[PDB]
Design a protein around this ligand. Sequence first.
Ligand SMILES: NC(=O)C1=CN([C@@H]2O[C@H](COP(=O)(O)OP(=O)(O)OC[C@H]3O[C@@H](n4cnc5c(N)ncnc54)[C@H](O)[C@@H]3O)[C@@H](O)[C@H]2O)C=CC1
Ligand SMILES: NC(=O)C1=CN([C@@H]2O[C@H](COP(=O)(O)OP(=O)(O)OC[C@H]3O[C@@H](n4cnc5c(N)ncnc54)[C@H](O)[C@@H]3O)[C@@H](O)[C@H]2O)C=CC1
Ligand SMILES: *S(=O)(=O)c1cccc(CNC(=O)Nc2cc(C3CCC3)on2)c1
Ligand SMILES: *S(=O)(=O)c1cccc(CNC(=O)Nc2cc(C3CCC3)on2)c1
Lengths: 344, 344
Amino acid sequence: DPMAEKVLVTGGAGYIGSHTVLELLEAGYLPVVIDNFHNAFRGSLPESLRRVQELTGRSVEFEEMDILDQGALQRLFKKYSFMAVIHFAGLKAVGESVQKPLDYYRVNLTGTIQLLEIMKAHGVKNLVFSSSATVYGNPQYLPLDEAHPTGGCTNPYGKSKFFIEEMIRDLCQADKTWNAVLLRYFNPTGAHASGCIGEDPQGIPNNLMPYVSQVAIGRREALNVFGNDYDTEDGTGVRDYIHVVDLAKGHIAALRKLKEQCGCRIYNLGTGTGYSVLQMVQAMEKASGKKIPYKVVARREGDVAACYANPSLAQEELGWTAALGLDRMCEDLWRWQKQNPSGF
Amino acid sequence: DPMAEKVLVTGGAGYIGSHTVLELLEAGYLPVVIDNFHNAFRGSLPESLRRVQELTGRSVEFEEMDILDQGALQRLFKKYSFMAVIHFAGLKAVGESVQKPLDYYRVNLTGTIQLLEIMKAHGVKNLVFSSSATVYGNPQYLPLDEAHPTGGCTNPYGKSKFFIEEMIRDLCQADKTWNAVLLRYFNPTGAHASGCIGEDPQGIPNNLMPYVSQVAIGRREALNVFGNDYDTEDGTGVRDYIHVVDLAKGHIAALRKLKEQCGCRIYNLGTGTGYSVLQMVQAMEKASGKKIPYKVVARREGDVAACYANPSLAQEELGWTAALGLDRMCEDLWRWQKQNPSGF
Ligand SMILES: NC(=O)C1=CN([C@@H]2O[C@H](COP(=O)(O)OP(=O)(O)OC[C@H]3O[C@@H](n4cnc5c(N)ncnc54)[C@H](O)[C@@H]3O)[C@@H](O)[C@H]2O)C=CC1
Ligand SMILES: NC(=O)C1=CN([C@@H]2O[C@H](COP(=O)(O)OP(=O)(O)OC[C@H]3O[C@@H](n4cnc5c(N)ncnc54)[C@H](O)[C@@H]3O)[C@@H](O)[C@H]2O)C=CC1
Ligand SMILES: *S(=O)(=O)c1cccc(CNC(=O)Nc2cc(C3CCC3)on2)c1
Ligand SMILES: *S(=O)(=O)c1cccc(CNC(=O)Nc2cc(C3CCC3)on2)c1
């Protein structure tokens, strides 16, 4: 029966993936997760997923494997009957990608190509790709909508995400039976409201929310603020943050869209309101009850004043809206950090 | 001794590669060719290379293998001592790429990544990449120089070439010991002056020179000309053609540049003069002695009036200039077709 078929979640042990697994379970889907533990903590599940099982009271099927392992992909697609794939597996630290680009291109490009090939072979032509709004590059107008130019980005991670988008678009053009939804978003933050799962400490973080929470808890003295004279409401730079639970629900919405036999579709996910650095400091002070000192330092050459996405098309075509604002992001991040100071 | 080391030529059995192998031999280099016969004719060499050996009186080392075969790349780099790699192996039919994009991305992207990884592992950080001037997309100004924007192209082949350029650029940024020369050019034509090698008949040709020669020899009735009211000297569209022998010598020049420990460098190769469709017809009439009827049909939406490259930087930094003009291109193509009507 179609509703007894499974959803494959690649990279499902990680931050966004584990929250998406929880939302899938809560929504009545049956997830199968694959992950190679490159960036996830190790019972017989990844800890994140062990905790998702406890939070939901429902079972998570899991296989430890690498998307680069063709034989493992073949065994997986023979063992399970997948209705669709939600693809999070990849390398994603922007700063790391500059130092080890070939790893990024190998995992992200070759891994995705191998996934697409096994999906094609097994007739599972239904993909949710977790993309990045960095594909828009520097804003030419704001808010960024799906018509904005893509391909500007100069770091290897962002390029890899753009290249994957293009490969999927070209695949869909060549085979109209494929359905794919590409979800573009900026910085995921927050955590499940239980505080029992969240983002494990990362080696090279992509955004400042972990740093602000670490100043608040006392592990760092102050937040450096790069520039306070931007043409913004408060002079600090404005960036786009989405609560991981809203993000995860957007991935479920994309999964539903595949059933419409939509072909290739592209949607921004976000709240539609950018946040300044000072607004984020102030929100985390309110959530944590602690002073968060900052230090204004010089602008970094190349940083833009403001960057955020227009999520209107997702509301119109996925029925999706973000329900969780900056205060909830801060409150939920703070709870996860307080309950799990070194993560899992 | 350094001059006893070898030059690896991937895809060296094909059209540009075989001519480059001949130029390497004539210049005193020692080539090792790999090719999987995807698009080359099968003695114990590919026929093109069997003929290159006869033309030069010198030996070509050859291994039949696929750049996607990691074990074969490992065996190859252990068996031979390479000073550098000239990389032609890939899929290259623009029209085919629209129909089977995933093959293009797999061979071109994953194959190149695997080549770069084995080169890194074996300390052979010296690459000539045979790129495509289609990376410039539609001209924003003419002639196209290396400062022109790249990334505009909308077909999967052109995208794959741009993505490979970017991966190599990012690799060089991350490891300053790499040297790479990316050579951008448009349409190779002509043949070695012996007429004993040339381009075998292709399934979906990228340019009209084979079609014009086929009208001349009588296998087709007329050349369709898409538009005769462009803002050009004669109203027909202007495009960029380079004689394959000049092109091959440019690849040798790039090989020499690697010895300067140049890092990443990018050069256009071409004559610097675009040719109109009618000029090409008229040149092939003169070379063949035959009437070449044409039929003016409507413009194709999207076709630009004129496209050609500025090869000045290659003259300044490689010492390279094209010596062979349109008449030689036509004469040499015609000789190859007359001596080898169905190719090898
Ligand atoms: N965190 C961010 O700032 C953003 C993330 N994304 C996208 O979200 C996805 C997941 O991101 P996060 O949850 O943030 O990171 P994450 O690193 O927590 O999750 C990724 C998971 O993929 C697994 N993985 C990595 N390579 C693998 C391979 N070769 N085979 C199998 N599993 C593999 C990792 O172990 C990890 O559990 C990636 O596609 C990423 O590009 C998009 C935009 C922003
Ligand atoms: N012909 C054109 O219009 C242009 C070609 N190029 C570039 O030149 C290169 C060679 O082009 P041509 O000589 O024109 O084509 P070609 O098809 O004659 O030569 C390519 C060779 O690569 C071999 N090959 C393909 N996939 C392989 C694999 N997986 N492993 C090993 N060998 C493989 C083929 O069998 C063939 O002998 C490609 O990089 C191409 O993108 C660049 C611009 C224009
Ligand atoms: S710590 O204070 O020394 C330290 C060092 C490096 C980075 C951080 C995190 N701080 C920020 O990321 N601040 C920040 C980002 C921006 C964007 C908006 C305009 C650019 O502005 N300030 C902390
Ligand atoms: S055959 O005459 O039927 C036939 C069918 C398809 C393609 C051809 C080759 N002819 C051309 O490629 N002509 C051509 C190309 C251009 C460019 C410059 C402006 C676009 O213009 N005419 C033959």
